[PDB]
Design a protein around this ligand. Structure first.
Ligand SMILES: Nc1ncnc2[nH]c3cc(F)ccc3c12
Length: 167
């Protein structure tokens, strides 16, 4: 038993809700919140800009030190950093950005990072300003992640489309 509430169960291990991931993070305080990161951990907009804003820019300060030490992430890769006031940990995962021409097959590699964590609160990778089809992203999630994932979808219209079209 865990504290996630109001989710629709899509599969054995994948759940979905129309929710603001920032508000869901602040209420649940999950062990892991996933950020929709880029390789530079520049959290300017989308999910990342919103998570960073909610930390009063502490996420960005921590991220800049991480990059100065380690260099950029790989597309499809991840790193674990602090969850600040939102979660114990933040798993920064880089899905491909279609608006940068990156290979959509890397979306499966991105979701594989979730399997290193027993339970996660997450957005749909590569959705939103990353330019992928969220229905495709949901399918890759369900077919790749084996751990327990609670997906927060900000847009109610997108949410109902995702549920109604789910196979
Ligand atoms: N794409 C998402 N999925 C789940 N939660 C979200 N909160 C957001 C806040 C923003 F400013 C932008 C995007 C999201 C978002």
């Amino acid at each position: 038993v865990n504290s996630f509430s109001g989710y629709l169960k899509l599969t054995d291990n994948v759940y979905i809700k129309n929710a603001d991931i920032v508000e869901e993070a602040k209420k649940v305080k999950p062990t892991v919140v996933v950020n929709a990161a880029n390789v530079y951990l520049k959290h300017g907009g989308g999910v990342a800009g919103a998570l960073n804003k909610a930390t009063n820019n502490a996420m960005q300060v921590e991220s800049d030190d991480y990059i100065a030490t380690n260099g950029p992430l790989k597309v499809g890769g991840s790193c674990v950093l602090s969850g600040h006031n939102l979660a114990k940990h933040c798993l920064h995962v880089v899905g491909p950005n279609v608006n940068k021409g990156e290979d959509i097959q890397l979306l499966k590699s991105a979701y594989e990072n979730f399997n290193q964590h027993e339970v996660l609160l997450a957005p749909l990778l590569s959705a939103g300003i990353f330019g992928a089809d969220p229905i495709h992203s949901l399918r890759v999630c369900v077919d790749t992640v084996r751990t327990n994932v609670y997906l927060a979808v900000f847009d109610k219209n997108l949410y109902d489309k995702l549920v109604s079209s789910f196979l």
